[PDB]
Amino acid sequence: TVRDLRIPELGDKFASRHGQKGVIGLIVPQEDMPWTESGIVPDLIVNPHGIPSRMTVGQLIEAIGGKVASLTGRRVDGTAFIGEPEEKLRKELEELGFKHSGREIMYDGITGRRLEADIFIGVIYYQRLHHMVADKMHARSFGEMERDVLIGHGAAMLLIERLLEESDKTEVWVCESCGHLA
Amino acid sequence: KVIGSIEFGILSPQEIRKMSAAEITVPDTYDDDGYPIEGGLMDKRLGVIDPGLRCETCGARAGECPGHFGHIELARPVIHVGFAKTIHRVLESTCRECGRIKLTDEEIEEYMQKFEVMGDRKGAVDKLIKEIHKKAKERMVCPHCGAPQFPIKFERPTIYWELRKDEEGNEYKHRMMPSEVRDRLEKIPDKDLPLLGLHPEKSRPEWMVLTVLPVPPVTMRPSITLRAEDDLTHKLVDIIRINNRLKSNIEAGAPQLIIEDLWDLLQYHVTTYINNETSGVPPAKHKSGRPLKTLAQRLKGFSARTVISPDPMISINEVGVPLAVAMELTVPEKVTEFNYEKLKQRVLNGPEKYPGANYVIDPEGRRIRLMESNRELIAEKLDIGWTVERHLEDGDVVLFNRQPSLHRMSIMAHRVRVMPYRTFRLNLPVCPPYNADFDGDEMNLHVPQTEEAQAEAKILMEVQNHIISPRYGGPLIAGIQDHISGGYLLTREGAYFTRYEVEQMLMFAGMDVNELPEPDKYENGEPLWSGKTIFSLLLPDDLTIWYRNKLCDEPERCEALEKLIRKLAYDGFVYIQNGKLLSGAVDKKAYGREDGKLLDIIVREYGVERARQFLDQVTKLTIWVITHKGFTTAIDDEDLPQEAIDRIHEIIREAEEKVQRLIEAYKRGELEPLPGKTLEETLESKIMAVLAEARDNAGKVAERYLGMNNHAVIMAKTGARGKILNITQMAAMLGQQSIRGKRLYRGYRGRVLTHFKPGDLGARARGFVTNSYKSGLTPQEYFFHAMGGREGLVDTAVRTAQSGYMQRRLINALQDLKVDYDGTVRDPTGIIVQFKYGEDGVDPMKSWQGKTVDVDRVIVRTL
Amino acid sequence: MIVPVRCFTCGKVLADKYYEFKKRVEAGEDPGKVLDDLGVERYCCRRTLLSHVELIDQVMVYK
Amino acid sequence: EEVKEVYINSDDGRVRRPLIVVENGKPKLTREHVEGIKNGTLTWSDLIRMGVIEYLDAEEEENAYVATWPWEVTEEHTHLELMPAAILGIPASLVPYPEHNAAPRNTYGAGMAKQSLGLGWANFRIRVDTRGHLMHYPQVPLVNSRIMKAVGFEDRPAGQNFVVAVLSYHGYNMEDAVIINKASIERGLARSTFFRTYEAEEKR
Amino acid sequence: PGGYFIINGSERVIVSIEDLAPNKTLVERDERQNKVVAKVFSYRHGYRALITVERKKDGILYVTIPNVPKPVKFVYVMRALGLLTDKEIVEAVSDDPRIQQV
Amino acid sequence: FRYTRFEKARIIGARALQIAMGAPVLIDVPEGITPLQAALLEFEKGVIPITVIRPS
Amino acid sequence: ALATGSWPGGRTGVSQLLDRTNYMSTLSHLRRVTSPLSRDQPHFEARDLHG
Amino acid sequence: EFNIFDHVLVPEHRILSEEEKEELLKKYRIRISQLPQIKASDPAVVALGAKPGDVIEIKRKSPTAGYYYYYRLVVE
Amino acid sequence: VDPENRRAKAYYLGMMALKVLELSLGLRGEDDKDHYANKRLKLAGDLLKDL
Amino acid sequence: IKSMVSKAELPDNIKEELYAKLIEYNEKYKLKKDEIQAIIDETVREYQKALIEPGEAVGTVAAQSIGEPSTQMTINVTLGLPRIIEIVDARKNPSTPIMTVYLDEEHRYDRDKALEVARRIEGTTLENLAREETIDILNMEYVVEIDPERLEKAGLDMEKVVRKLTGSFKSAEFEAEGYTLVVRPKKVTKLSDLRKIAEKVKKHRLKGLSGVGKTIIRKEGDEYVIYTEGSNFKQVLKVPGVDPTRTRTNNIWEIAEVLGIEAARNAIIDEIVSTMREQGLEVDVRHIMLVADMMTLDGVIRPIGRHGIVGEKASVLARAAFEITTQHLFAAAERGEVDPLNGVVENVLIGQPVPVGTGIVKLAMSLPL
Ligand SMILES: [Mg+2]
Ligand SMILES: [Mg+2]
Ligand SMILES: [Zn+2]
Ligand SMILES: [Zn+2]
Ligand SMILES: [Zn+2]
């Protein structure tokens, strides 16, 4: 048996328990990473455009719940139908010492002025999927629609180039007045 | 030196005899387990397949050696199964003794002249073919044999007859022999063949009756080693096996009948050789029951891939390629006077370093592998004319691909920009044409070799040359989500960027030195930069355009235009003047795909170098605004106070009792049925409309008691994944859950779930969620939503079947159609399908939303 | 798998406060106060110790 | 509407469901028995013998007016759900507050849980799986389900609690993409090991 | 948790099979090949066979047999079965007079 | 008065291929790249001797 | 026959390889229920979540 | 009771004299057999009285080029 | 399987016919063959028996 | 203001002239000479540079563009995507056809006049102007009965109901308890098969014109529009008020058999467009026009595949790899007469550059020096 050490590099797949799949886009140094006045530095930063389109409230609620859980010490029960109504974790989170809104004040690690807004920070449980880029990438030293695309653009030479010239090109001698291969 | 045409026909005996390398006479194969070389069917000057080179004069070792044909002198003629019906259709349409087509002079004259008007359409020529057939088949008085009464033919599978006369009122059936038939087709002159389905030169009728059987080459009959003999060879063995017996019986004594039996047997065998799956012909099987698959069963029966990551820091036409992938994929570059130094340094760097190489091809053609040996003595007096396979360099032409490949925009030419790590980097605005996102999507990478191919891709398939989609008159490559949000914040009424922000961040684009940055519009509150002016620092100095923004609606529609028949006090109707952004805000209306009003204009007026620039610099512009200012969604963005809650509660109760009154009325048979639909359908239809009405109303209530000036709402109203249809579902209610149309009924014999009373047709009972994703779904609602949620899974995934198939059909129908140089769409058989394409001849990728030159726009351009 | 030596986000020593943490809570003492009595400021560093699993007490009993 | 029939299934493949029988408004057996359940007094088998939990297949469930919660127990409710959160299966139980999400998203996440990386076998270094994975520093999901503890997912998790921030930085997280703290990675977070065993049989 | 076999090394598991209840009559829908049909799977020691009693649109009413399809009338099969008198077959179908009249 | 895209691509490719197999390039002297870009720069100066004979 | 997942009855996919990719995976795989229908033709009434 | 004629979806059908026929077939550099074709059975052809040999000049309103003239041969 | 058993199958078959007549009569309602009442699961046991 | 247009018609295509005339005239700012010259020069620049480049392959791109939105595409019955499939694949009777019958210049502005038409085309059998049916006692046999509502809003009455006896196999007469009775003392027609009587006797009724069902009316901009639940174009024209210059019907073939081929093409385009637009997505009309032209070519509308366009002649090779087609490629090739080409798949199967794209260009270069 052979083991292979695998560090979460560029391209690996990550996904929370809310069908929020994503690929690591860039690994940014903690220094450039923005920090909250409380001292918190993000582990994973998700684009805010992947929330209102989809309708996954459970992920946000889970963030708040993980924040409360981290502060209080309770593991928090999120069992379906019978878990703390979100507004209670929101109302407890503050008395623990944090804005109800799940957001805090974050400072830009690059320039330095704090962003003129609040930043929703939470603790959501992400799962690493077995889709590692290490086993996806490979190179070599194209069917119907793939023909039709080159046709649409009009790249004939490119077609031949890909489907024949780089395989089994065979040369035969045709008679001019006969039509039969010589 | 390439193929102009191919002209099919029928082989003459002479051809088969001349194109043969040797006459095959010995019915045997190899034999056996040692020494596979005979003198009839195997390599007797015919073809090579074993590691032994001997052949027919041409020597030509087993490696590379086009097979040679052979022949078989058939002891007797044999009807070709493929022509059987045609031969029949010919025989009873023409005259025996004569050779005429049993048509009057007049008929021929006007028929041929009706045959030239159809000389290209294969489908419409058969109508007249069979019509002619039947018109001749009815006659018995041909104009070229004093008429001698023609005994109608019979057929099948390969036998012919003629119900002749000799007695009187009799109708005996004289049998028909291949010799007779063939010699009877040899009388039909070249003049009559065109009136049929034959040729005087290409396809003579007599050739339909095989006199010589062409033997396939050794190369076409390869032996499938474990040896599993080839089927063709075996059946051939049987054919010669009978052929020789026949010839040997003809040369000796002739009891006639014997020769007839053997003749018909030979006929069977050839018939099987032509087609084993024939009709009326017992399939010649191998000793196992497994049928032999002959001829009719024979013609029948540099890239890379990886994950993708975003990169708004590379050019829109550029592609990020992992340097490891760049070190595997190589390009053929012939050493010339301009790259002599480069390539020598490349090959000297070996397969290592970064700008190295893996192979070298000298002019003789021998490939040299740079691995072993060393890059030392290899990289010597290369001289011009060699060829280096260097690793991928920044800028090389490369095709980027993401399956499924719907439109053409799925394969685009990119410029390699070699980077570490292990993913492909795609600039963000080029996501709509590929239909790619990120979650886990992987794409393909192609590396073309011949200079012609690379150029062609770089000239015609480059990203910048396809910002606009050919489907509709609009741009496909543009702002996605943050680009929209960033454009809004950058072009806002209150957009004042301190020097620190403007100065440091304009480096994400360019363009300043002198009369660009100037001069700080606002020093009122403080010396600062208006966002409109900063955005204005990109548009060229002559584009004046005006179009209403997304918010130019509701009672905020207004107007107050004023034509030229300068101050600034406007907001909605976006007004850009010579690069100066006077009024308006940037959103889905302003930038983004699909649209058709700004990005569209800068690509028509200034298409290649400018369009890419405006695109490239804008993303990085818009992005840094978003980034430096802070842009998020919290959980309180969808929260409504107690007041909105009580209001929604009262609304859902009202809708409930509305449905009950409908049910109580239905129970008592209080009729009131809808016109068209059935009574049971009336009840359902009325309820669905009643509840849908209430749903939209609840959502309308939700947009009031929620601050319309926070981040989330901006995105909804701006242009980054938005839709009021979903907003109602998140805050207010999801609504009625349906299954293929009707409500949720499929459950127990008397109800959906076991928590309701049998027959309960109430609102909650037939699947209606009252709560939204915020408040949370109840146990019932969660299940109902799951039943209704299965729809999207099934529907969206099923549509692929019909989409792909339908498209595959119409693709295989129109793939031949082109625009000829005379500006005409013609089918590949010279048939004018469309005099001037699209009526006007303007490419939809180049027209102003269907309009053949947007006249109102061109006129305005007078400054 | 034995407390992630140090921490992830807050990347300071934390392994050295494993035993006493667990053992202090293993008497009824609420972890959210036990942590406070030790060097546990921010929650990011706190999480690493809160939600740990110590699977190793299964894996060793093998090879 | 005009026939009365009585069916009895006692076969070998029926899928039933345990329910609290409710005669009138009072569900059979109360705190008297929960008190003993928490103790080593009555096991669950003893329960089914006593007559509180009843196995209803589809056919028998046809004659049942089930009450969701023990709060709406009128004198018509035949049976009572013990816990509706058990409606879904074992993988869907990994999702926190699933009733706050959309059906498709829940489907995705639930089916995606079978792709997570962690320890699923205490004996991995002796296992001979074709291809296996091992997440170095796994963690119990904060805000999880009561089910997760009974299933044994808490004893063998597959993932980590990432302190996530929501914003688009640098524009490298757009289109579902996600940005990661370098330091956290360099300190262990999200690291895992790949395993692949090759074999060789001395064929005779 | 167990529940799987170890064959040739690899851990093999039997995926539970959802079948339509054996030994039972089910009336199919309508107008695919001809109106209404009832369908009966029946099992006996390894082998499983099907028995349809399709009432096609003219009231013939046939029955399918495993050995060679070619359906036979319900009354043919009924009399070849063990019911002689018409009263036997008729009353065996149903004791309801109205239905008996059909 | 101009060329079509397809004709442009075709010509460029042709010239580049001519340059690959030898054949001195017209006015270029200080460069340092492949024959493709050579033909491309040559085209930017309109000195490519390749003419498109159109059937009309 | 148990190692190939093809029973005598003409049915196939009776036995699969116990999906072991993590803990949850195996447990879920042991509790998986499969129908024996057509992998291509659409069964709208068999796929919908029945009550 | 009126008639069809240039109505709902009906364009201006006209018949070509020998002159415009020859010239038209000369312009597009094509043979007689290469045109789209109509049938003598076509209602719009029998109404205008077209014979198997005529080339109908069709004038239709196009929402892109406005006015477009097509051409077709009457056959069976 | 024996000849005495015929007399029973008779009745059974009769009922099958009856059901049919009823559905064509508009007094049966098509059999929901997806309802789990008419659904039986073959577990490892019976599969191994049949094997 | 009378000269520029004329000599501008040479580079222009007539239509743009009408538009331009409209603008520079209807603008209260009448420019000088230079501005007009410059403007015409610019408009012409646009037109000359907007033309399609000869060498394009619009068949393939129109195909792709028309088949692309299909993936992103998930009483009146009506259709959606399957409609696109039905119209592209000919199909004699489209699933759920509809007619948008307009009225001429009199009933277009009168409700009482539109209603007459509506009830007159609706066509109602006996199973709709009823509620149920029952039997008799002993020898009474049977008898008619209800209902009565479908007479008190459509406007038919018991009279022409008595008329019905138009050579009927039986038919009686007895309008009593609102439920018209019908006693029939004869056979030689019916014996006891009261089931098969669903169609004939009850269905073989016709109270109206055309063989259609429900008809819903809807106004639209001071115009009354009649919506049909099916089609019978031939007999729809022979109805008082029906505007013969505007009746629209999605049911193809019928349009080709009544109006003609050009009208069939126009109907094809119109219908494709209407569907696409009523789905949200938009495709340029020129693609659809190409497909429609290619489809209505040959003198009759034919399906886009196998039994139509893909099924017709191209070259043998475009049917030689026609999926193992015994009775085709075997049939097509067994007829050895001629063979052309200059196709597309033939050239790629053979190893030749496709004649589309660049392939339709030929280079030339004098080699001195
Ligand atoms: Mg996406
Ligand atoms: Mg994706
Ligand atoms: Zn040879
Ligand atoms: Zn003669
Ligand atoms: Zn920390």
Q: Which chains touch I (3 or more CB pairs under 8 A)?
A: B, D, E, G
Our CA-based measurement puts residue C47 at a distance from the nearest CA of chain A, in whole angstroms, of 5
**Ligand 4 centroid from CA B151, angstroms:** 13
Which chain C residues have a beta carbon less than 8 Å from that of A70?
A: 43-44, 46-47, 50
* Deposited experimental method: X-ray
**Of the bound ligands, which one is closest to the alpha carbon of residue B189?**
4
DSSP string covering B455-483: HHHHHHSBGGGGSEETTTTEESSS--SHH
Alpha-carbon gap, residue B426 to B466, rounded angstroms: 16
Buried-exposed string D166-188: b where 16+ CB fall within 10 A, e elsewhere: bbbbbbbbbbbbbbbbebbbebb
Nearest to D167 among A56, A119, A129 (CB): A119
Going B417 to B419 to B424 to B426, the CA torsion angle's sign is negative
Decide: E34 and E44 in contact? Cβ < 8 Å.
no
At B859, list the tokens. 């006129």
For chain G, say whether B748 makes contact (Cβ under 8 Å): yes
For chain A, say whether B633 makes contact (Cβ under 8 Å): yes
Decide: B388 and B369 in contact? Cβ < 8 Å.
no
Q: Specify which residues B228 forms β-bridges with.
A: B224
Dihedral, CA of residue J305, residue B821, residue B120 and residue J338, to nearest 10 = -100
Decide: B370 and B358 in contact? Cβ < 8 Å.
yes
Q: What's B631-778's CATH class?
A: mainly alpha
Our CA-based measurement puts residue J243 at a distance from the nearest CA of chain H, in whole angstroms, of 9
Q: Which residues contact D174 (CB under 8 A, 6 or more apart)?
A: A25, A47, A49, B310, B312, B428, B438, B480, B481, B482, D168
Alpha-carbon gap, residue D160 to B626, rounded angstroms: 29
Q: Specify which residues D26 forms β-bridges with.
A: D23
Q: Specify which residues B176 forms β-bridges with.
A: B160
Chains F and G share 3 or more Cβ pairs within 8 Å:
no
Alpha-carbon gap, residue J327 to B277, rounded angstroms: 12
Residue E68: count of CB within 10 angstroms of its CB: 5
Domain that holds residue A118: 8-141
**β-pairing verdict for F51-52 and J363-364:** antiparallel
User: Where are chain C's structural domains?
Assistant: 1-63
**H helix runs in B57-113, sequence order:** 84-91, 105-112
Residue E76: count of CB within 10 angstroms of its CB: 12
Alpha-carbon gap, residue B744 to B753, rounded angstroms: 10
DSSP string covering B152-203: -EEE-SS-EEE---SSSS----EEE-HHHHHHHHSSS-TTTGGGTT--SSS-
Contact D122 C62 (CB under 8 A): yes
At A96, list the tokens. 């623990």
Decide: J120 and J207 in contact? Cβ < 8 Å.
no
In the three-class reduction of DSSP (H, G, I as helix; E, B as strand; rest coil), residue B26 is classed as coil
Decide: J301 and J253 in contact? Cβ < 8 Å.
yes
Q: For chain E, where are the E strands, in sequence order? A: 5-6, 11-14, 16-20, 24-27, 38-44, 47-50, 62-63, 72-73
Decide: B545 and B576 in contact? Cβ < 8 Å.
yes
For chain B, say whether J315 makes contact (Cβ under 8 Å): yes
Q: For B436-579, where are the E strands, in sequence order? A: 442-446, 468-469, 474-475, 496-497, 529-530, 545-547, 574-577
Which chain B residues have a beta carbon less than 8 Å from that of H30?
A: 830, 832
DSSP string covering B362-413: -TT--EEESSSS-HHHHTSS--TT-EEEEEP-TT-EEEEE-SS--SGGGEEE
CATH placement of domain C1-63: 1.10.10.60
Tell me the residue type at B44: K
At B48, list the tokens. 């090579």
- Phi first, then psi: give them for residue D133, nearest 5 degrees: -135, 150
Decide: B718 and B488 in contact? Cβ < 8 Å.
yes
Superfamily of domain H1-76 in the CATH hierarchy: RPB5-like RNA polymerase subunit (3.90.940.20)
Instruction: Show the CA angle centred on residue B253, arms to residues B250 and B256, nearest 5°.
Output: 70
Contact E78 I31 (CB under 8 A): no
B199 labeled binding residue: no
Our CA-based measurement puts residue A157 at a distance from the nearest CA of chain C, in whole angstroms, of 54
Decide: J17 and B827 in contact? Cβ < 8 Å.
no
Decide: D200 and A12 in contact? Cβ < 8 Å.
no
At B812, list the tokens. 């295989």
Alpha-carbon gap, residue B623 to A56, rounded angstroms: 25
Decide: B358 and B388 in contact? Cβ < 8 Å.
no
Decide: B508 and B497 in contact? Cβ < 8 Å.
no
Residue B189: count of CB within 10 angstroms of its CB: 12
Place of tokens 């029998």: H46
Cis? peptide before B519, omega within 30° of 0: yes
Closest CA to A110 of B627, B498, B631: B627
Decide: A45 and D165 in contact? Cβ < 8 Å.
yes
B541: left (phi over 0), alpha (psi -120 to 50) or beta: alpha
List, as ranges, residues with CB under 5 A of the ion ligand 3.
Answer: B 55, 60, 65
Tell me the residue type at B563: K
Tell me the residue type at B364: E
Alpha-carbon gap, residue G42 to B800, rounded angstroms: 13
List of long-range contacts for B156-161, beta carbons under 8 Å, 24+ apart = B156/B84, B156/B279, B156/B280, B157/B81, B157/B84, B157/B271, B157/B278, B157/B279, B157/B280, B157/B281, B158/B79, B158/B81, B158/B84, B158/B267, B158/B271, B158/B280, B158/B281, B160/B79, B160/B87, B160/B88, B160/B91
Nearest to J55 among A148, A151, A154 (CB): A154
Going F15 to F20 to F23 to F25, the CA torsion angle's sign is positive
C54 labeled binding residue: no
In the three-class reduction of DSSP (H, G, I as helix; E, B as strand; rest coil), residue A149 is classed as helix
Tell me the residue type at B291: P
Q: Between the CA of residue B118 and those of B123, B863, H37, J258, J310, what are the distances in Å? A: 10, 58, 11, 27, 19
Our CA-based measurement puts residue E60 at a distance from the nearest CA of chain G, in whole angstroms, of 30
Alpha-carbon gap, residue D26 to D10, rounded angstroms: 29
**Ligand 4 centroid from CA B101, angstroms:** 9
Nearest to G30 among E1, E10, E17 (CB): E1
Q: Which residue of I has its CA nearest to G47?
A: I34
List of long-range contacts for B770-773, beta carbons under 8 Å, 24+ apart = B770/B652, B770/B733, B771/B733, B772/B729, B772/B730, B772/B731, B772/B732, B772/B733, B772/B734, B773/A55, B773/A57, B773/B729, B773/B730, B773/B734, B773/D100, B773/D101, B773/D102
Cis? peptide before B32, omega within 30° of 0: yes
Alpha-carbon gap, residue A35 to A43, rounded angstroms: 11
Cis? peptide before B843, omega within 30° of 0: no
At C62, list the tokens. 């093998």
Buried-exposed string B791-827: b where 16+ CB fall within 10 A, e elsewhere: beebeeeebeebbbebbbbbbbbbbbbbbbebebbbb
Alpha-carbon gap, residue G4 to B328, rounded angstroms: 39
Confirm whether D46 is a catalytic residue. Answer: no
Alpha-carbon gap, residue B30 to C23, rounded angstroms: 86
Decide: B540 and B610 in contact? Cβ < 8 Å.
yes
**β-pairing verdict for A44-46 and D178-181:** antiparallel
Domains assigned to chain J: 1-315 (no CATH), 316-361 (1.10.150.390)
Closest CA to J27 of B548, B546, B853, B862: B862
**Ligand 5 centroid from CA A29, angstroms:** 16
Decide: C50 and A70 in contact? Cβ < 8 Å.
yes
Decide: B738 and B744 in contact? Cβ < 8 Å.
yes
Buried-exposed string B642-655: b where 16+ CB fall within 10 A, e elsewhere: eebeebbeebbeeb
Instruction: Show the CA angle centred on residue F30, arms to residues F28 and F31, nearest 5°.
Output: 80
Domain that holds residue F26: 1-56
DSSP string covering D85-119: GGSS-TTGGGSSSGGGS-HHHHHHHHHHGGGB-S-
Alpha-carbon gap, residue A46 to D176, rounded angstroms: 8
Q: Which residue of D has its CA nearest to I44?
A: D13
Task: Classify domain B467-630+843-861 by CATH architecture.
Answer: Orthogonal Bundle (1.10)
Alpha-carbon gap, residue J169 to J199, rounded angstroms: 14
Task: Choose, from D12, D57, D155, D176, the residue flagged as catalytic.
Answer: D176
Count how many Cα atoms sit within 13 Å of the Cα of residue B773 in the half-sphere of its side chain: 25
Cis? peptide before J369, omega within 30° of 0: yes
Alpha-carbon gap, residue B856 to B836, rounded angstroms: 25
Alpha-carbon gap, residue E3 to H53, rounded angstroms: 82
B303-329+392-466 has CATH 3.90.79.10 classification: no
Count of structural domains within chain F: 1
CATH label of the domain that carries residue A37: 2.40.270.10
Element (H, E) at G16: strand G15-17
Place of tokens 């202090």: C24
Closest CA to H72 of H26, H13, H6: H13
Q: What share of chain A is helix, strand, coil (3-state, %, to 5)?
A: 25, 25, 50
